[model samples]
Target chain A: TYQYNMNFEKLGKCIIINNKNFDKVTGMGVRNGTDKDAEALFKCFRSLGFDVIVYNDCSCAKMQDLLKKASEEDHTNAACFACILLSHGEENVIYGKDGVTPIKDLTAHFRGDRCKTLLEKPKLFFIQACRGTELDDGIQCYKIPVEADFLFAYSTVPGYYSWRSPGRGSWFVQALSSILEEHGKDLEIMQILTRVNDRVARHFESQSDDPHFHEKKQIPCVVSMLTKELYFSQ
Target chain B: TYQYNMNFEKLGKCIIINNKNFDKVTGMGVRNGTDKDAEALFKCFRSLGFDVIVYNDCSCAKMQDLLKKASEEDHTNAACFACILLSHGEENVIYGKDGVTPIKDLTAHFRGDRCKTLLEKPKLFFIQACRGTELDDGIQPCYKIPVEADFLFAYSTVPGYYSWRSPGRGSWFVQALSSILEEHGKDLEIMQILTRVNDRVARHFESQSDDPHFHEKKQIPCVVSMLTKELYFSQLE
Candidate 1:
């Protein structure tokens, strides 16, 4: 199997934007278990050798500024880049403690033309936000390199609700960390994500006292533009 | 590498909807090279053990009727199902012989509840159509099996650009796809094969329109995966 060259000076940077509290004017409630998600993500990516960083309670402007700054930095010695956003969101948009912003606007900072150092490097994005109000749905390497290596790991399928719990965090992050912890170094990137998807689909079910939400299912969606087999190890 | 069980009695059915000769009101030219794509696909899939079928220039209603009819058939003996569509398109819609139609309307017939035999089996769709009017300036690159599970959508180009074709040969995506599948269908995972297709198209082709403005453009395919596991075409033990 072809793979990414994970032999750079660093495995790369992982930015976790954990938004737990929201402005009352926005009518968004606190994300009760996100801290657990963020902490687990921090430890997981750190163990995988990423230089992980976390931001808490960021406003829309601050969220933009931080990622923009991260993109502006020279990643010449880095193998790739990763960003995790844990927040409340709807289809194609994520909330910034203060207001909502488009996911594209935040990520465009690191496009191939803009962030030259990350050119040809894997640019991974994990969004632990909901895509809409619907529910129940559902790497590697080599030469000339893929000009685009963006992989979006979304929490739920588009147009459905993404269930979260006060105790276990969102199902997406829970399974993601668990699998990455166990198989991060052994399997190919896609294999790892597939295991995460299977875990969420088979292991978890929403248990709500509200009949409308009880016993529902969730499945994670992956939109990948990777051109090679990707491996975090070897 | 968790792959689907491809050891069933048959690989499955492959549907090729090669649409051309759009109605005058639709303002679309006949797709000159699509038939080339259909034949190449027929051979390629058939070689991989699929019972391939081709439908030419279908009307909007006919397109819906055919796939819906197909969804109702018994796929109990198959490992997976695949469909190929070649035509003009815009955003989430594909043009039929008579007019335009939303893609979801045609595809929803095979949704889990409607096509129970295909439930939990890999259902693949490959579309060779334009996604939108915008273009990516040079830099290029590019499912599952499910109720919503086990479905894979392979597009000729990412959203907002032209999907290229050669009047004599075929679309670049199909040519590269046929080449790659024939070369590696027995040895590699489906995703890896797709990446090679993406690389081949991205590196090997460039538009050569007579007008300078329409010349030298690049395109990359978009792959959306919802399949729960890795997929391979070989009947491996």
Candidate 2:
């Protein structure tokens, strides 16, 4: 039977970094349902007992300040820390108006040993940005065995175009919201994300006027290092 | 102050699948280092507190039987389970005497909250197989975070070509063995592997004619799940 550690607490806190507009650049908004989609995710997380906060379209300076403050503030008391970034990106980088910054830079603030208070706690990042220029053609399924502590859930594989529904939302947000609504209080994070992958791959389909976009399916990629079964609510 | 639901004493058995040669297939052992390499990995695992059994040049029939038995065994009471496959391969497939078999087939036995007692325990798989046709060209340095987990997959590369190394000693195995041996109990599994990749790539290089036979500075990815570290030991056995 599974057991919880003495450090197990009620739930955790999270901060969302949602950049819906690029000002000078064009993005798929209404077609992608980014804002509404993020709101839904926010509500879902709130329901799970997280003290959640959201920031919209932050400029480079603003983003740097926000993250810096977040890193400095005392989170030694929270169960976990989470941040989501929805933006345009290039290889190993995420964009802010001033320019691009490495994804690793945004996350390095909360390393376990470095951020002692949050040590042994989950540090989650949900990145919805283009990791590279490659296209995503789904691969054959494989069964996975375990779970991890620090988890990163990407809307698409590295270097691939992630499909979005002009009417609904990106494949990732839709499925993630659905899973958290159903199992956030019971299932582990990995189990939930695995289901998210299954739902998106099996349920959603892309049909675009662009030949390459047509007949495409997106699969959420999970990079994890979680050591325990994390439930949004227990 | 962390604890385990089940300790090493409750660990189930492990199976080692080494497929570098076949009796009927000629020139099977010419791949620069086959027999000796697999055994070295096997020995390292045994020293890590596992009840290990090695199978050499297994047929598809043998492979099926081994998995079936492993699945049937009551590891429900065991702490974890592991299987390592050392083989020549194409992308997504491993070799089995007559031809190739999907890598998925080998791992599918332990999924769906079903046969494998280790539904949540670390089901470690160290695959030493070529994933595709390309070779790593190395890259700029980067930092990776640490983690705890359920399953840890220590792949030789992102896929494709031989995973590089010196001839007298196989690259992948040498690095893997040295890393595990040096840090198995000292650091978390992910930390150890990342450091292992660093050690190997930094020290080993390739000549222009040799196609730069090192990791090409790519990150050695470790896929993990449901693992927590408590009182990390430098050496348990």
Candidate 3:
């Protein structure tokens, strides 16, 4: 049961930072399915009533500048904020056209102390990138006051490869979009993400030529410091 | 369905940091009913097979030392770890007998990178303390690196709201948690058990105080999880 109203029209802007192609100088290969992930996110967030904006091919500096700008804007009228990053990554760093940037460098700008306008409000980040090259064989598993109120949905668990389909987009983004489309208005954010986990874990698997990568499993990781329930209304 | 087998006997240790008495210097009044909460937790976690340890009225340094010791110990044979804090608190700080300590400081020690013995094992924490003094009016509508994995935190109330306790009966959180564990600990996953705890707290308990400040109130527990798989308490037959 959620405590806050699900008001999408008044919810904050959704910024999609889709980094598809890295520069040749950086030696990073281009991402083929990321545009689809971005488009899917853009459409899903738009249908959910976010004023979605897409920024393509951002360099490390540009990524920082864009988020800083967005975080600095007046959010007095908005209920929450959402950002999606579809890019190449290694552990805690996401790559720009020019080079790698610590994910924290981009996120630190939006912390409660730095971004006064977004204080006490839900700030959601959905990252679809490989945390590392290691694969999961699916083993059994398992905040400051001012630094509160944030949620991160990572595509795969740490030290693991996050799979993408050139034809179908990333397993994570597709599941996330589909789940949000079906349950975003009704279920709390965690429940929706749980279903996303189910989808990615059960419905999809790697079909790569390497035996080690074939039929491999993946699960999403959700980290929440949110102070209240979040429901994205229809 | 959860994939891992749950073995209670090897489910690791549950540490109870029960702070009932406070130093006069801290200015925090004594907690009247937390001992009851602590005892209840001890019994419940013992039932769940944790090698339960209770530390009473510990100073800030003692609290830190205890956790550091636990973190440094070898947990290669244990399945998971748990800690329960019963005390007075502010928004993000839980009170030590002598003064206040940030909740994060207590938890950060068990991070995967910091506590290799407990790495990839669930580090569960149940905090039954106020996040702030605000009452719920109830209108409501609404990682990477080894250092960032397999932890779950179950806070007694949402941030900025007081977690309710009764002088005679114990905290609504520990009571509900124990009862739920009693009934479902054998069959349910940790998240499932906690969801019931949340439901019970939200629906069953209401303040009975004559003080307008405390009457007809509601509270919801918060669960922050980084668990990577379904966790059950005992082996499924």
Candidate 4:
């Protein structure tokens, strides 16, 4: 059932950290790279009354320190937390300077016991990483768990090519920015993400040069920790 | 999407009233039949913290008087109003003592101007009344409405034929009621109720005496309402 109300009373402060450099792509250059994506998402979060900040291409150690500091300083005051990592990676591992890092390590800093202040608040992570070497869309099923509230917005399904536009931007970032700019205030996180899935699923695809990435659609998976419906603006 | 909140703050009071028996159906010989459908609903409402009252079959004049007095007396306090009517009916019409009466007549007494106290609060009406005489159930489509706030209507079916049942249970009322009670705090109103309708339509119906009442069929209708999502259970407790 769709929640018709646009209520964001429960929404609190948010913080975003993106790390992607698109200047080194083959046929499809990073074009409107991480800077553009970060700016769009920053505006999106600020419009929702969230005090947000963005860090571009920080080393893995710097990333860890930044999250640790942010967690220590604001966990007591915010009702929700958000982080976006735009890096290259392998299964469940995101990239940092020295080498690859486990995604869990970045998030463990705010576990219930570790960051008690944000124990019950929603924690969201959006990752634009290459999860595996293969390309697979797997299967489509309907049974979704109702308890997982931490919405993890992945750029593409595991083992698949994450589509991007040479002129536009990454499919995930483009759809996300458009949807947030338009319906951010009225739609729940799931609702908005569903639309994002629909957009990426139907709109962009890979071409010959990026054939592995061409004509292929992707779906964003969300692991939500939300206990109630959430809307950004309305 | 789906609302996942279980925290409802009680802001005011609410009540539920169900009336299931119609004199016209007295001799129709339907099993599990009684004027008690409303009573069951009344109990469910009570369990949910509503100050409930159950009125058996009453004359049109009596029904009018009861609701009027309720509205008249509620002029000073802030409260939400809810009424559940279970009866035989045609489109937009419910059964009264004399004959079929327009359902609006019963609800008009509590309009914003008439009952100032409940002006901005939700006014919900759950009617288990049949609306027409249609009988096909292959692809049932629900009626859609275009309005906002002030009222909510939950009808049992789009039109006709014993909505369905079993020996000890499975009335549309219980099916919908229990579904709502179980998921009330977890989902938004429309999603919760719509899911209940799906559950009942998909699993409840069966063939009783070889008549094949639905024979493992599905029945779901559309509901269109103009409501902003901020409406929620009272946060009083």
Q: What is model 1's interface RMSD?
A: 8.8
CA lDDT of B122 in candidate 4? 56
Ordered by lDDT, highest first, the candidates read 1, 3, 2, 4
iRMS per model, in Å, is 8.8, 17.0, 12.0, 18.4
Residues B1-237 of candidate 4: C-alpha lDDT, one tens digit per residue: 222122433323444433444465443223344344554565556666666776666666766777788777653344456676655566767666446667767877775556665544556766665566544233110211111224445555543333443435545545566556655733344434543454444334433455565443333332222122334443432
Question: What are the lDDT scores of the predictions, listed in order?
Answer: 0.83, 0.59, 0.78, 0.55
Question: Which candidate, 2 or 3, has the higher DockQ?
Answer: 3
* TM-score of each candidate structure, all chains considered together: 0.93, 0.54, 0.61, 0.46
lDDT of 2 by residue, B39-95 (tens): 676676566656889888887667867887787777866667778777766777877
Model 2: CA > 4 A from native: A1-10, A25-32, A137-148, B1-221, B224-237
Model 1 CA deviation exceeding 4 Å by range: A137-147, B139-146
Local lDDT at A116 for model 2 = 55
DockQ of every candidate: 0.33, 0.06, 0.08, 0.01
Q: Is candidate 1 or candidate 2 better by DockQ?
A: 1
lDDT of 3 at A65: 94
TM-score of 2: 0.54
Candidate 2 lDDT score at position B204 = 44
| Tens digits of lDDT, candidate 1, A127-229 | 9887776555220022232235778888877776777889988888899899989888888777888777777766677767987776677778787777678
Superior candidate under lDDT, 2 versus 4: 2
**Interface RMSD, Å, model 4:** 18.4
- True interface contacts reproduced, per candidate: 0.24, 0.04, 0.05, 0.00
